[PDB]
Amino acid sequence: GPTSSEQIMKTGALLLQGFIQDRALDPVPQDASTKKLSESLKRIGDELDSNMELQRMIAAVDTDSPREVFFRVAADMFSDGNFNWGRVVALFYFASKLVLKALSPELIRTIMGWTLDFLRERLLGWIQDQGGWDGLLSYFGTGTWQTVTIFVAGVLTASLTIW
């Protein structure tokens, strides 16, 4: 079921992989909720793509160690010990941005593993408490593409600054 850790990891990999192919390994087949989730992540990422302060900040991380900056940003976004879906979206979106800079190639799988490792270690308990990824569906329903973007862009920009 969708609260099983194994299902959460699998759906998470699929959402992350499918999301990284938007902004820029074979697509194992998908379900109905996960299709709705992929469409939503695409919409948010397009909206985040046009958030100018966010893009200015992402352009500001001159990163010779993508792993260093990635774990510093993921930790900082969660360093208060709380969780919410906006931070998760921020995490996925930032991983996709690191992929884009690497387009100068095996890093897709590398960066995906960083994100799923952070997901498993730091986030899985909270997602279980949410009922699984359906929690994220609700988060997109309770709001507006343009409204949720403000908050995702807010958490990601704040974290990129500390670094």
Curated annotation (Swiss-Prot):
One matching Pfam family: Bcl-2
Keywords: Acetylation, Apoptosis, Cytoplasm, Host-virus interaction, Isopeptide bond, Membrane, Mitochondrion, Mitochondrion outer membrane, Nucleus, Transmembrane, Transmembrane helix, Tumor suppressor, Ubl conjugation
Transmembrane region(s): 147-163
SMART domains: BCL
Gene3D superfamilies, sorted: Blc2-like
Result after altering M52 to D/E: Strongly reduced interaction with MCL1, BCL2, BCL2L1 and BCL2L2. No effect on cytochrome c release and subsequent apoptosis triggered by etoposide
Motif BH1 in this chain: 76-96
Outcome reported for the amino acid change (mutating S159 to D/E/H/K): Constitutive cytoplasmic location
One GO BP: intrinsic apoptotic signaling pathway
UniProt motif BH3: location: 37-51
Effect of G45R: In a T-cell acute lymphoblastic leukemia cell line; loss of heterodimerization with Bcl-2 or Bcl-X(L)
One Gene Ontology CC term in the entry: endoplasmic reticulum membrane
Tissue spec. comment: Expressed in a wide variety of tissues. Isoform Psi is found in glial tumors. Isoform Alpha is expressed in spleen, breast, ovary, testis, colon and brain, and at low levels in skin and lung. Isoform Sigma is expressed in spleen, breast, ovary, testis, lung, colon, brain and at low levels in skin.
Taxonomy, superkingdom: Eukaryota
Self-association state and partner proteins as the record states: Homodimer. Forms higher oligomers under stress conditions. Forms heterooligomers with BAK. Interacts with BCL2L11. Interaction with BCL2L11 promotes BAX oligomerization and association with mitochondrial membranes, with subsequent release of cytochrome c. Forms heterodimers with BCL2, BCL2L1 isoform Bcl-X(L), BCL2L2, MCL1 and A1. Interacts with SH3GLB1. Interacts with humanin; forms fibers with humanin which results in BAX conformational changes and sequestering of BAX into the fibers, preventing BAX activation. Interacts with SFN and YWHAZ; the interaction occurs in the cytoplasm.
Function (record text): Plays a role in the mitochondrial apoptotic process. Under normal conditions, BAX is largely cytosolic via constant retrotranslocation from mitochondria to the cytosol mediated by BCL2L1/Bcl-xL, which avoids accumulation of toxic BAX levels at the mitochondrial outer membrane (MOM). Under stress conditions, undergoes a conformation change that causes translocation to the mitochondrion membrane, leading to the release of cytochrome c that then triggers apoptosis. Promotes activation of CASP3, and thereby apoptosis.
Protein name, per record: Apoptosis regulator BAX
Gene label: BAX
